[PDB]
Amino acid sequence: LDAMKKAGIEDRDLQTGGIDIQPIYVYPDDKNNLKEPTITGYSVSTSLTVRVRELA
Amino acid sequence: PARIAVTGEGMMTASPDMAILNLSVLRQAKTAREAMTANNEAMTKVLDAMKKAGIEDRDLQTGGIDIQPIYVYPDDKNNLKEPTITGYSVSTSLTVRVRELANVGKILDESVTLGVNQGGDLNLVNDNPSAVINEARKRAVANAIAKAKTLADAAGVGLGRVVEISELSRPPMPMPIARGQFRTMLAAAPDNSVPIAAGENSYNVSVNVVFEIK
Amino acid sequence: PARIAVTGEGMMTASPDMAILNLSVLRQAKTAREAMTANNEAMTKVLDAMKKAGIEDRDLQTGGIDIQPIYVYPDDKNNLKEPTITGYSVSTSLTVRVRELANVGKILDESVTLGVNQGGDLNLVNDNPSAVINEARKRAVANAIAKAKTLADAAGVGLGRVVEISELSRPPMPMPIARGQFRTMLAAAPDNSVPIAAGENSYNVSVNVVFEIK
Amino acid sequence: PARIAVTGEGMMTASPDMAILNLSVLRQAKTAREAMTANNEAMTKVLDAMKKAGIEDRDLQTGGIDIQPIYVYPDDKNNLKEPTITGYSVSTSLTVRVRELANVGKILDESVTLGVNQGGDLNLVNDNPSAVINEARKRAVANAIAKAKTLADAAGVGLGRVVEISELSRPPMPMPIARGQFRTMLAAAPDNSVPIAAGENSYNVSVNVVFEIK
Amino acid sequence: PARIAVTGEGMMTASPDMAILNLSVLRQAKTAREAMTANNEAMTKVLDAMKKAGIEDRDLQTGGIDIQPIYVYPDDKNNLKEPTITGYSVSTSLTVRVRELANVGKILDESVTLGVNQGGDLNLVNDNPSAVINEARKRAVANAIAKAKTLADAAGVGLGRVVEISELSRPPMPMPIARGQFRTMLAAAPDNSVPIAAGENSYNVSVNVVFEIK
Amino acid sequence: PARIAVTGEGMMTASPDMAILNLSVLRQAKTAREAMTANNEAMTKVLDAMKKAGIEDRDLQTGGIDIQPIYVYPDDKNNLKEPTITGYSVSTSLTVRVRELANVGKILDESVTLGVNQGGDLNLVNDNPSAVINEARKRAVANAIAKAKTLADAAGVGLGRVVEISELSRPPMPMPIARGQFRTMLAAAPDNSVPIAAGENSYNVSVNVVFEIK
Amino acid sequence: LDAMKKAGIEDRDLQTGGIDIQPIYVYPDDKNNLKEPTITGYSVSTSLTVRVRELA
C-alpha cells in the first residue's frame, strides 16, 4: 500500500481485511512412502482492494 | 530319428527368513540448495540411529534422490487463478535388511518414530534362494526323467541317452502364495512331504528333456 | 547333435552420478524476427550465467527451436468470432549436464532464478552405464552356465563346448527401481550383494547359450 | 556350426540446419475458371516477393491444386435448407527452403504479411540426413561387435569372422524429442558425446550380426 | 553361408499433369423405360457439349448405368404405409480427362452449368508415372547397395556378389502429400533434388538385397 | 542360389453389358398346402408373361421356396396376450438375365406391374468376364517381368530363366467402382490408354515371379 | 498349535511361516479434523496350515 499511496491513490480509495490462512502440503508420489499428505508450512493472504478514480 | 520328449516341472517352497524395509527420508526447504543439505543432514542422522539401533553396515543402502517443487493452489481468496511455487521437497531412499526375522518389530517401530515412514509394507525374502531354486531344478529334470520312463514302457520301447535338455523359460521369481492362488500350489506340490502355507515363497522350474528311443 | 540350451540373465543396479536438466527460454515479441532475436539474446544471457555458475561447455548443449503464434480468442466485448494473431513466442531449450550431485540444488535454483521453467524433471543417470551394463551382461552369461551345469548333473551328462550364444534382445533400459518394481527387483537381486535402494537404477540383461553334451 | 548372434544398435542425434515451410496461397471467385487465375497470378506475386527477400530457385518449388465450392449455410433466413454454391476457392501450395537459422523470422513474417499461413508448421530437417544416419549405422555395427566380444570373453571362447550382417528393420526417421522421451532418449546416447537436447533430430539404426565361435 | 541383408527405400516425387473428373449425369421419370432414354438423350447432349468444349474422343469415357426407385415417404397427411414408388431415377457416370491443367476451370465450370455437379475432386494425377515410379525403383536398389557398402566396412568385410534381390511389397502407389504427411516425407526424401511441395504425388519403392560376404 | 523375386499386378476395366434381375413371387393362403399351389400358379403365370415379354429360356431360372407362418399381434382389443398364427406366405425366386442392356427398361417396368417386386436393384455384369481376367493376368505377369528387368540392371546383373511363377491369391471378383474407392483405380490404372468410370467393373491380378540371376 | 497337537494332528501335518504385518488406521469422519488417516496401531497374522488326514 506504501507503493500505492505513492503510486497515487489516497487513503480513501484503499481497503483491507479478510485474512485467509491454510496449510501447504507434500503430496504422495513415486518416492511416496508418505501416507496421504503431510504439512510443509502454511500460506497466508489478506485481500486488499484499490479503487482507481480517473479511469484513464 | 526316434525320440521321446517331455516337460518336467520342479517344486520348492519356503519361509521368509528376512525382512527388507524400504524407507524414505524427505524434509523440505524454501529453495532447493538447502533442500538437500537439510535432507542430507536429516539423513546421516537417521542412518546413524539405525547402526546404533543395532543394524550392521552390510544391511544398509541408499541413493534415489527426488526433487519436487511445492506449490499453492486456488481457493476462496487466492491468485494467478492457479498454483505457484513456494519451495521444494527432497526425499531419499534408504533400504534396510533385517536379518533374524524376529527383530523386525524392534527395527520397524523405531522407524515410525524417526519420522521416516508409515510404509515398510510386507516385503520378506529368503536370502539364500539360489540354493532352493537349484533343488527345484533337480526335481524338474529328475521329474522329466520319470515321465520319460513312464511313456516308454506304456508304448513298450526303450528309454535311451539324453539328447537335448532345454530351459528356455523365463527364470523363477519367488512366490508369495496369494489368496485365490491357493490350491494351485496344493495341487502342484510334491508327494509324500511336509505341507505348505501362505506367505511362503515358492520357486518352480520347467525344463524340457528329450531322450532317444531304444 | 546333443546340446543343452538355457537362457540366463544377471542384472546390475547403481545409484546415479549426475543430473541432466532440460531447460528452456521464454521470450516472445510482437513479430517473429525480433522474437528469435529477443530469444537469441536472453539465451546467451543465461549461458554466461551458467558457465560462470560452474559448469563446462562439454557439459551443456542446445539447439532446436519453435515459434508458436500467440493469440487473442473470443470472449466478452470480443466481437471477434474467432482468433487473430497478436505476436509470437519463440523459445528454445538447453540441456544442462550436472556432474557432481551436491551442486544440483545450487544450479537448479538458478533455473528458478533467472528464466527457464519448472524442470530438472528428476533426470538422473550414472555417467557411463556402459560399464554397469557390461557386468550385467557378464553375470548373465555366467549365470547361464550355472544353470547348464545343474541340469547336466541332474541328468547325468557332462557339458561340452558352447555351441552357441544369442543376445537378440532389444538393448537394456535403465528401468528405475520404483514402488511397482520393489518386489520384482528384489526378486532378481544377485544374492548377498548390497541390497538395492528405491530410486536406484537397474540395468538388466538376458542372454541364451547352448552347450554340447560331453 | 558355432556362433554368437547379437543385435547391435547405434545412434546419432543432430541439430536442425535448414527450416522447410509449407505455406499455401488461396484466392476466390464466383467461378472456377475465373478464380483459378486469381490464384495463378497471386502466386507469382509471392514467388517474387520471395526472391526479393532473397530465396533462391533451388530453394523454391510448388505444385498441386485444390479447387472447391464455397457454400452458403442455413440459419434464420436460410432456404432449400441445405446450403448452396456461391462460388469456388482455389489454393496452391508453395514451399520455401530456408537455410541459415537466425534468418528465418525474416522470411516468416513475410508470410503473415502476404497471407499463406497462420503460425507455420515449422518443419526443420538438416543438411544431409543420409550423413548422420550413415554414422549411427557405423556406430551400430561397432556396438554389435563390441557386444559379441563381451559375450565370448565371458563364455571362455574366441570371437571369429563375421558370417552375417543384416538390418531389414524399417529405415530410420528423423525423430525429434518430446518431454516423455525424457530419459528414454538419454539411454541410447553415446557416453560423453555432447549432452543431448530437446528439438534435436534423433536417428536410430539397428542391425544384426553373427560371428562364428572359435 | 556368409551374407549381408539390406532393404533400402527409393523415393520419387512429382507434380500433377492432368485432372480427371468423374461426372455422373442423372435425370428421372415416372417409369424405368423413359428414365433410361431420358438419360441416354441428355447424356448424348453433354458429351456433345464437351467434344465442342475441347476434349477429344480419347479423353472421354462412359458406362456404369445406375437405376433406382424414387419414393413418397409417410408424414402428417400420411395414411400411406411406409413408402410407395412415384417414379425412378437414372444416372450413368461419365469421366472427362482434362489434359493441359490450366484448362480445368474452363471445363470444370461447364461440367456444372450443364448439371452433374462434382467439382473436380482434386484428382489431378500424372499420366506416365511409370517413369517416375521406375525412377524410385532404380533409386531404392542403388541405395540399398550403398547401404551394404557402409555395413561391410564398419564390420571390416568385403561386400560380394548380389545373391538376391526382391521387391514383393505392396506395389508402388501414388500416395499424395498433405498436412499430416509433412515431416515423414521431407525427412525420407532425396537430398538436393528440388524441395518438395504439398499436392504432389509420391512414389516409394522398397526392395531387399542380399550380397555375399567375401 | 541367386534369384530376383517380384510381384506383378494386372489391370482391367469394363462396361456392364448386362443386367440380372432378382425377383420374388410371393402369394399367401390360410394353409400351406394351398400356399404354394397358389404361388406355383401365380408363378407359371408370371414366368409366361416374361417369355412373351420377349425373354429367351436360357435367360431364366428359379428355385428357392420359402414358407413363413403369418401371425396377428397384441394391441388395444386382442389376445393370447401375444401373436397367434393365421396363415402362410410363400415366396419363390426367379432371376432373369437381361441381355442387350438397353432392354432393361422394357423388362424392368413390366415387372413392377406383375406385382413381382420393387427390387431389381442395380446388378449388372459382363457375361464374358473370363476373357478379361485372362488379359489382366497377362499384364500382371508381363508387368512382373518389367520390374524384374528393371531391378537387375539397377544392380547390374543378368535376368535369367523363370524359376517360379505363383498365383496363390484369392481370384478376382469383379469390381463395381465405388465412391471413395475413386482414385485407387485412377492411381492403379495402366499408362497410355483410354480412361475409366464409375459403374465399370474392374478385374485385378497379382502374381509372383522369380527369375534366376545372370 | 498346542490345541491342535492335542486336537489330534501330528507335527507332520502342521505348517507355519508367512508373517504379515500392516498398520491399523483411524479414518476421517463427522468429528474429523483428522487429515486423511492416522495410525492407531498394527495388526499381525501368520498363516498356519493344518492337514486333516482321515476325512471324516
From Swiss-Prot, chains A, G:
Q: According to the lineage, what is the superkingdom?
A: Bacteria
Q: Where in the cell is it found?
A: Periplasm
Name of the protein this chain belongs to: 26 kDa periplasmic immunogenic protein
What species does this protein belong to?
Brucella abortus (strain S19)
Q: Which residues of the full protein are shown?
A: 83 to 138 of 250
